[PDB]
Design a protein around this ligand. Structure first.
Ligand SMILES: *[C@@H]1O[C@H](CO)[C@@H](O[C@@H]2O[C@H](CO)[C@@H](O)[C@H](O)[C@H]2NC(C)=O)[C@H](O)[C@H]1NC(C)=O
Lengths: 49, 50
C-alpha cells in the first residue's frame, strides 16, 4: 500500500510538516513548559534577593 | 536622589558636590575551582575562575 500511494504519502507528509512549521509560530501558548521552568527559576532567584 | 532596580538594590547614586550621577556596580566576585588529575599521576593543578 506504500508503493501504490508513494506520491500521496509524500504530499501529505510535506503538507503536515509545513502546517506544523506554521502552527509552531501561530499559536502563542504552545511553549508552556519551557517558559514556566525558566520563569520559575527566575522568580525563585529573585525572591531570595 | 538615588536609584534602584527590580531586585531592591542600589544601582545609581547622585553626588552632592556635582550635578552629575555616578553608577554603582559591585566588585567582581566569583568562585574558584581547581582542575586536577589524580595525585598519584601528577602534583600540578590548574586554577579556574568562574
Ligand atoms: C558645593 O561645593 C562644590 C565644590 O566647590 C561646588 O561645585 C563647584 O563650585 C564652584 C565654586 O563656586 C562653582 O564655580 C562650580 O560651578 C561648581 N560646580 C558644580 C557642578 O556645581 C558646588 O556648586 C557646591 N554646591 C552648592 C553651592 O550648592
Amino acid at each position: 500500500v506504500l508503493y501504490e500511494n508513494q506520491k500521496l504519502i509524500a504530499n501529505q507528509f510535506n503538507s503536515a510538516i509545513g502546517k506544523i512549521q506554521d502552527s509552531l509560530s501561530s499559536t502563542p501558548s504552545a511553549l508552556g513548559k519551557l517558559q514556566d521552568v525558566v520563569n520559575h527559576n527566575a522568580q525563585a532567584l529573585n525572591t531570595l534577593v | 536622589q538615588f536609584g534602584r532596580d527590580i531586585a531592591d538594590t542600589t544601582d545609581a547614586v547622585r553626588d552632592p558636590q556635582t550635578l552629575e550621577i555616578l553608577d554603582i556596580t559591585p566588585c567582581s566576585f566569583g568562585g574558584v575551582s581547581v582542575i586536577t588529575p589524580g595525585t598519584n599521576t601528577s602534583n600540578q593543578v590548574a586554577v579556574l575562575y568562574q
